[PDB]
Design a protein around this nucleic acid. Sequence first.
RNA 1: GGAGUAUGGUCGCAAGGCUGAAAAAUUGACGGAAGGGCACCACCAGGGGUGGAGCCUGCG
RNA 2: CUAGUAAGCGCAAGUCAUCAGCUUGCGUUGAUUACGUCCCUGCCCUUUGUACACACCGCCCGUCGCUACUACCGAU
Lengths: 785, 49, 164, 36
Amino acid sequence: YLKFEPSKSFGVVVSSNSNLVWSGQAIVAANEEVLVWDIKKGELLSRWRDENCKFRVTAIAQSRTDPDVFAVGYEDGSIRLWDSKIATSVVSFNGHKSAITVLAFDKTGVRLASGSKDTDIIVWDLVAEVGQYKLRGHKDQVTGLYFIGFLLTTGKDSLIKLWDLSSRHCIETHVAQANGECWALGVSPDFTGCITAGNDGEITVWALDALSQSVNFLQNRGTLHRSSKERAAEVVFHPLRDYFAVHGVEKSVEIWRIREVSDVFVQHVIVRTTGKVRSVDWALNPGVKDLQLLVGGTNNLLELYNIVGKDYNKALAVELPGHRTDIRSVAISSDDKMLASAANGSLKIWNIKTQQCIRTFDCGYALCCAFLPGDKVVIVGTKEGELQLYDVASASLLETVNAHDGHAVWALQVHPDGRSVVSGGADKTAKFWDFLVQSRILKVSDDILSLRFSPDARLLAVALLDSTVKVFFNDTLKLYLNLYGHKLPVLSMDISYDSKLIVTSSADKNIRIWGLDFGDCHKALFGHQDSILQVAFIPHNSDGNGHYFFSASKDRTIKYWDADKFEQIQRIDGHHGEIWALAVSHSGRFLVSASHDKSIRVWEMAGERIAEALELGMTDLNTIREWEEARQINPNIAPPQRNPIFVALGNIPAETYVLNTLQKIKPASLHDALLVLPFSTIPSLLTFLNLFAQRELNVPLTCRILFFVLKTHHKQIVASRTMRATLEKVRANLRAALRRQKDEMGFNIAALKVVSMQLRDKSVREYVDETWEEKVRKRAFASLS
Amino acid sequence: DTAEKGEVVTKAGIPIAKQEMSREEKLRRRRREKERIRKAVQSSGAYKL
Amino acid sequence: AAQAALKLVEQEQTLENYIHAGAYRDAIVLALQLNHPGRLLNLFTNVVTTRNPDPDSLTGLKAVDDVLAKLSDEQIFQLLLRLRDWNTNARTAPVAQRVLWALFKSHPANKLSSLSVKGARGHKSLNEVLDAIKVYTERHYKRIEELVDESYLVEYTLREMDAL
Amino acid sequence: IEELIKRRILAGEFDEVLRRRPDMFGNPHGVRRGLV
RNA sequence: GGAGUAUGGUCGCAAGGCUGAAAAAUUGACGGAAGGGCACCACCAGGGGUGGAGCCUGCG
RNA sequence: CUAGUAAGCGCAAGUCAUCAGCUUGCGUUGAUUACGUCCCUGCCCUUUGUACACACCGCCCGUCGCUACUACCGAU
């Protein structure tokens, strides 16, 4: 039951997320890991590969004033601070919910902003390693972040937002686009201006200055428009000269210069790139008078252009350590030391121990690929119905035949003896080519999807568009038998080395285990959330495991199964774009995995409560009056040093505290807790009520609890003495407060009587006639009895 | 039943506008209302590709 | 609609800044202009509870007194809608009491009679909303009245402690 | 018997007495007795 | 002869297997905090069995 | 186990199921001890409705689902 482990992972340069970085080194993001290459020589300097986290990362940031320490923001919402001196995440922050979108570093690098798709923005002390706080604006997700302290940010609702840092809330807002969406944010590093790129290609330009009155810092000094009316992706300034670059995801970037606003800024150049650029990045090099623009193109490429200052030239490039459009097929060698790699547009073969590409060919499309025994030569069936033949040694194309007209040849199977190949197309014919020439063709009902030989070259089986399978004899092409039951067309097949079993994978999210003697389905099995792409046995039962097999499925999953017990023995995660192809070692020692991830991987008490609150408020009043005596003696610095719980509650006054913590409880319980209070607690409560009346609030409550205290202890109060002055205070305060209230509302009802009668007099009658009977509320009052 | 247009009444009977409302209170009042409520053939190219 | 929305969000956030500042006067006037009574009520509660009132100001802020004296009739009327709600509540009643008290002390009853708004139709017309105000004020007046009739006890007991 | 219980509790039916109101007979529509 | 009621026997259908054992949801799924009501399967005052030895119905 | 109750004491019957290695009756004598409280343990029920005056209260909180819209990403 040897479980398998990802041993290698490669074939790739920058994924389709943003945030390229330059240092003469290029810092790009793989799927999970973050790797650095040299641009002069295409050798990667290193990788930053975290064994703990498997989420993709999409946010990459360099600390200003300190390189070699770098922040990354993942798909889950985590933050990792690494070094380049040593490939170690020094810290991780897990504060958001999903997909850290924008990062930000301090001018001094002690502070870090994290903006996410989950729309909340969390700042981070970088020496206390704490979520400092959490600015909450932004009805939808952030599309930009910058530090000034102060913060400027833009969110996808086309909303630009200026927060303070010391006083945690925003002070300025504007909209970029009334109906559109601000997508990108560009800041003058000298804090003079800001530009907002919105989805029409509209670049609104803004001037910036560096509270009871009208604060105004930003001004829309105008708007501009680029040529591309696409969603602009990113706008990057020159750190030194007066230039910047606008782009969306396109094969073009518009570099404009700095000298009305359209006069201020004109397009310097527009660089056409070979591919849709994902992310742009700046580079300046020591000793050049040029501009090193480092673009990372969505089709898995790196490009370096030189811009002259007072035309572009494709100066440097990185394409060879990975394919470019989408990997489709794989054929690992019989000695299992190299492998052919078949992508749309390209074919690259690679040595596995170097995990490094050795040869490269251009195709148009690559449906399927397979070397020929001896591994001298390789074969690709391609979308146009056609068939192309290359060799690995001279690195050339040998032959090419039109297998089908334009009927994409879906399946390719070398003969087990290795003197013929068979080819199955988007036509109704499966052809047979002995090497070559065409030995024999096969006419069927529908278009063939997949097929395979028998390891003992004795049978074959085909898997058709009709959700079915036709097992035929190898020698003569007679119907052995047929398979059904799959509701959707069977996508792949695989049979046992002893030709005793078949797994059949279809797009109906399940596989079938067939017994190959009369073809009884030994077990139908739903085991994948999506369309299972491919299935593969191990050839060798020399380990004693030959009826174990593997399933690659559209939910980014590989699953390891045993047919004999019909059980899941392992589950294989690790890719994040949908897997397309995979292959097993001839010895079965490992396996390679090709995905739309564009990677290949190799796998080996109540009153008591108010009593204490009263006590706390007494202490509060004591330190407050003492602080008053201090500040009255001298206006020197004097902190009141209230309780941590008061300052945790936001410096609220003690009276507010006690009234709130009393008003929380229900009335009956109030009656009883007020009852249960003891007499030492009484006069402090009296002083609180005195404060309440003097700063009157919830006056019926105050009177009520007052009278309760007095009646339940009417004797002990007239026993004591120190009550007397306090009771006089509460008498004066309460009597004046009640008088104030009553007099005001009595004024109110008086004036209301006046205006009501006057209104009636306005609304008496106008005409005078014989019918005076035109001269009243009513209510319903259902009663059941 | 006598509420204003952009605003809704509270259970306390206090006027709040949905615009002056916060998102958090919005979520919580949705939760309270729901709480009361609960108390009551294709191409092979597309297929393989 | 676009330029109106630009203005709206501008004034909305500047309102927010006023609230952060405690810029009470302009806060209230733009709060009236933006018609949102929760925040408006919060402001009213604070301004009747400043803890340092001008002894001459009817509300503790002569600026608020001035702007309510400078109110237009329609502003007055929508305010009255908010007032009748806050009078219906009895926790909010004193704050609901103080403002109309100044508001009555500001404007003459001839103007108050001659209020004519287009939004006076059905239940939300003048006689009715003032009527509801009348009844709820009556309830509270009764409440505080009997409350004072109770409160005389502390004078009695004080006189007793004088007797000893 | 555990099987039968399972069937009924899934397909929820019981032969329970219910709380029939005392005033179906005179209030066959069951009005609320307050404001209308 | 009519109308019913039963009763049994006859007859036709039901009685042709892409197949090989192990959802609904504007209403739902699951918590949590506070507050009440209760109970010799809770607290508290006690009482009283069995459980030690012998006899044996029963049950395992 | 909280009132003719715990317990004691015998006397009889022998009821279509059970029960004589006992069941079930009837009478006889008859106490102590709490008779309160949700603190522990729990169990249930509030936070919707089902009636209006006085009176009082005053927008519970969490993680997800389903729905409409918005825009994004990548194959065909």
